[PDB]
């Protein structure tokens, strides 16, 4: 059947039954990084490879100032409505005198009466709404925090140092319980800050990024984002399967967003974002979302 501690110098006089190798062996138990975390690593590898620095996104609660108002999204936008957003109840409002009053002033000014060459939005901005805590709808929020801190530090330093930032983290949407979409999901964001950038640079780093995951051909559709003009939906051709897919969204951040921060018109930021879940369930051929993540996600 099988050798033993005793059967050396005495194994010759016995029967070695056939072993049916047309079979499987003993089942082995082994540990597993979650599929979603493997996807997250691969993306993070791509990002560190292109020289990018991870941003801090260690938070789920966000004030609407960072999530909406500092991105130059108006307060009467469907993204700021209860139906589509988890608003926070008990820690309902953030601290007064969050960030800097000068920045808050710039944001109110541009939102209401225009500034920086922009016409504005021609409503009257309310500080009261800006302080309502939500579960962040995107990590674009933390990117805006980071953009503001590097504005505030380069105003003191006087120097505009080019930089590259990425984040991968969970965000929340008040979708239904009938699995139309997901209540939670992870978002991948990257951006670059320097002097005089534009869609040529976006398409460069975009095709870089995306070939790095096996999509050599890209196409670009104009679409709308309130924080990014111009903006383009990104499609890419999946080699191993038949068709083109929607793989990302991106654009150039608006002047009202950045210049409110302190940046001069020289400075521009290019940014893009995409899901983690969709790559995952495509690569591993996962049918529906609830077989990956959540309490009923075995194997």
């Amino acid at each position: 059947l099988t050798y033993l501690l005793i059967k050396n110098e005495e194994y010759k006089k016995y029967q070695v039954k056939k072993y049916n190798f047309f079979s499987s062996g003993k089942k082995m138990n082994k540990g597993n990084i979650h599929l979603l975390i493997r996807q997250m690593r691969t993306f993070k590898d791509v990002f560190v490879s292109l020289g990018f620095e991870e941003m801090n996104t260690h938070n789920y609660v966000e004030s609407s100032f960072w999530c909406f108002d500092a991105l130059y999204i108006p307060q009467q936008h469907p993204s700021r409505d209860l139906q589509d957003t988890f608003f926070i109840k008990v820690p309902e409002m953030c601290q007064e005198e969050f960030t800097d009053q000068s920045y808050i002033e710039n944001v109110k000014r541009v939102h209401s009466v225009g500034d920086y060459g922009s016409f504005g939005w021609n409503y009257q901005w309310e500080l009261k709404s800006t302080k309502k805590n939500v579960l962040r709808t995107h990590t674009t929020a933390n990117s805006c925090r980071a953009l503001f801190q590097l504005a505030k530090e380069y105003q003191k330093t006087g120097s505009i140092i080019p930089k590259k930032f990425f984040s991968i983290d969970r965000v929340f949407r008040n979708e239904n319980l009938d699995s139309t979409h997901l209540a939670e999901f992870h978002q991948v964001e990257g951006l670059i800050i320097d002097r005089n950038l534009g869609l040529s640079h976006l398409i460069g780093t975009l095709s870089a990024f995306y070939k790095y995951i096996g999509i050599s051909k890209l196409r670009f559709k104009p679409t709308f984002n309130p924080y990014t003009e111009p903006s383009m939906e990104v499609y890419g051709y999946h080699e191993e399967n038949k068709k083109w897919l929607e793989v990302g969204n991106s654009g150039i951040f608006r002047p009202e967003m950045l210049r409110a921060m302190g940046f001069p018109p020289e400075v521009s930021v290019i940014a893009w974002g995409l899901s983690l879940e969709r790559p995952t369930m495509i690569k591993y051929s996962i049918r529906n979302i609830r077989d990956l993540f959540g309490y009923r996600s075995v194997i």
Partner: protein, 606 residues
């Protein structure tokens, strides 16, 4: 995201000019920013989606001319804001701040139809739902002009004085039975109870006392919209003055073209009472904003490379913008009231980019750093074995001919052997031999990993059992006339198991299966088994276990692992022979797997 327009398919008109069909309409919308969502009959309606911010694309008419200009012609549109004396409206102290503003408009001498009538109400619902955000910020009402005795006013009146015959009914409805009356209207219960729960109710009413409308969609039945309505009066009541402005400008703008003195709407004035504001407003406004850009910004942002202002004037025309040149280093655009979405020079740049075609901006071409794949593959192998609690080992690349052959009870292949395939696993290939080792035991470069871990196992047989090691590294052998040095390296992985009571012919087998399964390469047995359970396994390539004998392995217990359909031997697995356990001073049974991870690499999935 985005609002789905339901337009027709008989839809395609002259307006289109070509009646170009689906396939080039598709690259036209892609190049423009629209996705053609669906087509579905009731025959063959086209439901499309448009930017949420270009409210001048929420009706078929606003699309028609936009997409028309996108290629066809600018067709510099004509307006005519006549008139203030015969047709006005006033806003009462009553009006307050729950719903402050009204904007009115008079489209005189209007063409009438019954599916142009469908057109109108589709437009009204669309602006109600998105811009107006389900009527929460503005409500629009369409009244036949002629049935409303001017002037008119907008007040918050005591509900007991409100009585009118809504569009629904033939029977009057008092204010104080109003909500209760529509409380269960499927289409309207929504709006009703929330929007309005004031002490007084908001009404727009003519000088004849005739209630004409309210926040809740009901309006008087008397000013109905029906064909043979010679001309129209529109009111829009709202909490935001500006968005109501934009609302009515869109409405009268977009059906001016289909009233017989085409592209002409008559105008109204709204004078608030002393207490509220106190001011007044002459609708329609219709101002152009005429921002002027600088020539460096537009190409640095748009990444348009080399092009100048003589190339710009045609580009905006396709987006329905009017354009003229000031200077090599200056522009002069006027925003159409159309484009409420333009707040900055960058919105013009966006439109110029779209007119240019997002497929025609030349890329930065950012040079990336490719990554060696062999390293990649072996690191995945490392991880998948560490996760089964196997410990990695690293041995000497040099040994003695005595260790590799004699103690292993075997002899190496000939240096003139021409059956040797460089893609296969070649443990007894002819070795690389050293001239001057200054250390006697260093005669050759290893050609198999198994010997060194046999040494290792002997080293640690005292330790705690079972022993579960693996090594993964380079082997070398002689290849005359096939490499530039006449030698080659290969990358092997060996997995050794040892225990007092068993050679794991079951656990080594399972380990090989598990390791290869990680890369979606399966046994043929596995593929048969799971397809009898009617499951689709990766079948196009696989591996099999071929029983053979080997001087160094206990008989009937060693196997060649063979890649199919290539038919290439890429590993061995079995029990180690007791004699060579003696030779290597090993007093416990031992099982082994060795594979040449370079054979299977290109079929592995990672």
């Amino acid at each position: 995201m985005g609002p789905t327009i339901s337009v027709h398919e008989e839809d395609l008109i002259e307006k289109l000019g070509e009646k170009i069909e689906e396939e080039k309409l598709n690259d036209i919308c892609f190049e423009f920013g629209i996705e053609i969502d669906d087509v579905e009959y009731k025959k063959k309606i086209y439901k499309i989606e448009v930017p949420a911010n270009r409210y001048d694309l929420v009706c078929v008419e606003g699309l028609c001319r936009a997409l028309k200009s996108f290629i066809g012609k600018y067709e510099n549109v004509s307006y005519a804001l006549l008139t203030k004396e015969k047709h006005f409206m006033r806003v009462d102290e009553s009006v307050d701040e729950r719903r402050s503003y009204v904007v009115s408009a008079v489209l005189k001498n209007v063409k009438m139809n019954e599916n142009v009538y469908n057109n109108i109400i589709e437009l009204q619902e669309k602006l109600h739902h998105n811009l107006g955000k389900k009527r929460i910020l503005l409500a629009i009402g369409i009244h036949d002009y002629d049935k409303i005795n001017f002037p008119v006013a907008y007040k918050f009146e005591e509900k007991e004085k409100i009585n009118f015959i809504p569009l629904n009914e033939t029977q009057n409805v008092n204010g104080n039975n109003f909500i209760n009356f529509y409380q269960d209207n499927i289409n309207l219960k929504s709006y009703l109870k929330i929007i309005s729960d004031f002490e007084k109710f908001p009404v727009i009413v003519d000088a004849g006392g005739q209630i004409l409308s309210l926040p809740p969609i009901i309006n008087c039945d008397y000013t109905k919209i029906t064909y043979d309505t010679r001309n129209l009066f529109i009111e829009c009541t709202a909490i935001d003055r500006n968005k109501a402005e934009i609302a009515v400008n869109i409405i009268c703008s977009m059906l001016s073209e289909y009233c017989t003195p085409k592209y002409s709407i008559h105008s109204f004035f709204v004078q608030y009472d002393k207490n509220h504001k106190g001011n007044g407003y002459l609708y329609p406004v219709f101002k152009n904003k005429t921002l002027t850009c600088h020539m460096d910004y537009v190409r640095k942002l748009s990444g348009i490379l080399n092009l100048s202002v003589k190339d710009v004037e045609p580009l905006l025309k396709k987006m329905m913008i009017t354009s003229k040149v000031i200077d090599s280093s200056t522009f002069t655009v006027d925003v159409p009231f159309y484009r409420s979405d333009i707040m900055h020079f960058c919105d013009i740049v966006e439109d110029i980019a779209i007119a240019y075609g997002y497929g025609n901006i030349v890329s930065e071409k950012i040079e990336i750093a490719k990554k060696n794949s062999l390293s990649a593959c072996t690191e995945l192998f490392r991880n998948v074995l560490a996760e089964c609690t196997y410990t990695e080992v690293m041995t000497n690349a040099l040994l003695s001919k005595r260790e590799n052959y004699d103690c292993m009870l075997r002899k190496h292949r000939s240096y003139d052997d021409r059956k040797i395939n460089l893609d296969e696993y070649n443990p007894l290939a002819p070795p690389v031999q050293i001239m001057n080792s200054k250390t006697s035991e260093y005669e050759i470069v290893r050609t198999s990993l198994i010997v060194n871990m046999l040494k290792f196992v002997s080293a640690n047989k005292h330790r705690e059992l079972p022993l579960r090691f693996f090594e993964i590294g380079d082997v070398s052998y002689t290849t005359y006339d096939r490499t530039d040095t006449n030698a080659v390296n290969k990358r092997y992985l060996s997995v050794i198991f040892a225990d007092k009571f068993t050679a794991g012919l079951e656990e080594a087998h399972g380990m090989l299966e598990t390791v290869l399964k990680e890369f979606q390469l399966f046994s043929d047995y596995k593929i048969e088994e799971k397809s009898k359970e009617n499951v689709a396994i990766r079948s196009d390539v696989f591996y099999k276990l071929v029983p053979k004998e080997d001087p160094s392995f206990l008989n009937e217990r060693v196997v060649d692992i063979v890649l199919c359909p290539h038919n290439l031997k890429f590993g061995i697995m079995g029990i180690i022979h007791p004699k060579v356990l003696e030779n290597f001073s090993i007093d416990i049974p031992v099982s082994v797997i060795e594979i040449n991870i370079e054979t299977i690499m290109d079929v592995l999935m990672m």
